[PDB]
Write a protein that binds this ligand. Structure first.
Ligand code: HEM
Length: 360
């Protein structure tokens, strides 16, 4: 209704995220190109998500069903800057500041436009992502492309179980649940410039995991990095499942363990990211595992393509990452190799297009 799909939907097994740069120059020309791409993409994304044949498409999905395809479109602040639309950049749309430990690859970062393609089927996701690319080709070219994955519905004991990441951790437990007032408050913009109300702000970070170093820790040490048991996801301040535990039991940051130590370490990931240290502000983490084989030096390159939605990145992603960068035990085992912020606007009205209000 009011929102773009692909945010509150349960994330399916496959992701293809493409950031694009507008290829013309000059504010008037960039403005025209930006509207043209948004116009074409809004219409095409609807055809594709309905499972209808797109004019000019390739037969790479012939013989397939729609497979939960969602297509979510965001604008980079550079698109508005390049188009001379600076006055319509809301306060929340501020640039993500450089932070200690950053190792951002410029070629994999930023972008005028971002397209999140999700589907349960890998061909469906790659195919739709290439169709969006084809349709924008005269006005925009990919700047970077990330493919990601999560466990499949078919193989899961239950398709609704929280995914594990490549570190073996349950990843998503304290996300707000879709359809709840907590989710709406955390995720959707509800004030400010009209064009972004019922939108959300997306922060992408391609976070490499140092998995060989990770594997040298025993599970006790790995659990202590996060603040939750790796086995069952319970807070280390709470009992494990079977001794009264449940993953909904919130962490208690002053509880003592049986050996008298602070149960959740002062540098535990969950301690430093918890809303109670950040004014109650939560975020929707909708990330995907990635595995890009070997980097240029022959070293493994796999991790988490982090993708968080929030009403205000300043008080969500940025405020939390500032704390993590200063002290998180997890920092030993991860490297942020990219960053991109996108304003993901509300759903277009019938016959309109995404972010059309910028062009009034
Ligand atoms: C590869 C990098 C990362 C890994 C492996 C990781 C892993 C985890 C795990 C295992 C949990 C506990 C279960 C859960 O509630 O989902 C968690 C919670 C959380 N993480 Fe991360 N995370 C990473 C990066 C980040 C970043 C970059 C941010 C924000 C800047 C972040 C923010 C959060 C938040 C807000 C929570 C929930 C806190 C709560 O309410 O309990 N994480 N993460």
């Amino acid at each position: 209704g009011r929102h773009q799909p692909g945010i509150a939907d349960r994330p399916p097994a496959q992701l293809v995220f493409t950031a694009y740069d507008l290829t013309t120059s000059g504010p008037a020309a960039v403005r025209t190109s930006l509207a043209a791409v948004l116009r074409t993409w809004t219409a095409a994304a609807a055809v594709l998500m309905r499972g209808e044949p797109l004019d000019g498409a390739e037969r790479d999905t012939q013989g397939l069903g729609p497979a939960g395809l969602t297509i979510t479109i965001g604008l980079g602040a550079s698109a508005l800057r390049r188009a001379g639309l600076d006055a319509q950049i809301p306060a929340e749309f501020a640039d993500i500041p450089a932070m200690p430990g950053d190792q951002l690859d410029l070629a994999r970062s930023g972008g005028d436009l971002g397209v999140q393609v999700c589907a349960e089927d890998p061909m469906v996701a790659v195919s739709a992502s290439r169709q969006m690319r084809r349709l924008a080709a005269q006005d925009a070219r990919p700047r970077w492309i990330q493919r990601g994955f999560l466990r499949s519905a078919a193989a899961a004991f239950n398709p609704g179980s929280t995914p594990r990441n490549l570190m073996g951790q349950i990843d998503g437990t304290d996300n707000p649940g879709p359809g709840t007032p907590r989710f709406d408050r955390a995720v959707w913009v509800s004030s400010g410039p009209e064009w972004m109300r019922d939108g959300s702000y997306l922060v992408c970070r391609r976070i490499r995991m140092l998995l060989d170093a990770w594997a040298r820790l025993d599970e006790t040490a790995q659990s202590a990095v996060i603040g939750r048991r790796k086995s069952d996801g319970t807070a280390l301040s709470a009992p494990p499942v079977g001794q009264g535990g449940a993953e909904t039991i919130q962490p208690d940051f002053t509880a003592r363990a049986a050996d008298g130590s602070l149960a959740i370490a002062g540098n535990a990931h969950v301690r430093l990211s918890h809303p109670s240290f950040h004014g109650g502000i939560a975020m929707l983490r909708r990330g995907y595992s990635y595995d890009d084989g070997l980097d240029s030096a022959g070293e493994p390159d796999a991790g988490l393509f982090f993708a968080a939605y929030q009403a205000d990145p300043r008080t969500a992603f940025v405020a939390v990452q500032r704390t993590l960068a200063a002290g998180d035990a997890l920092n030993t085992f991860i490297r942020h190799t990219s960053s991109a912020l996108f304003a993901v606007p509300p759903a277009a009205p019938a016959g309109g297009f995404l972010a059309q209000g910028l062009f009034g």
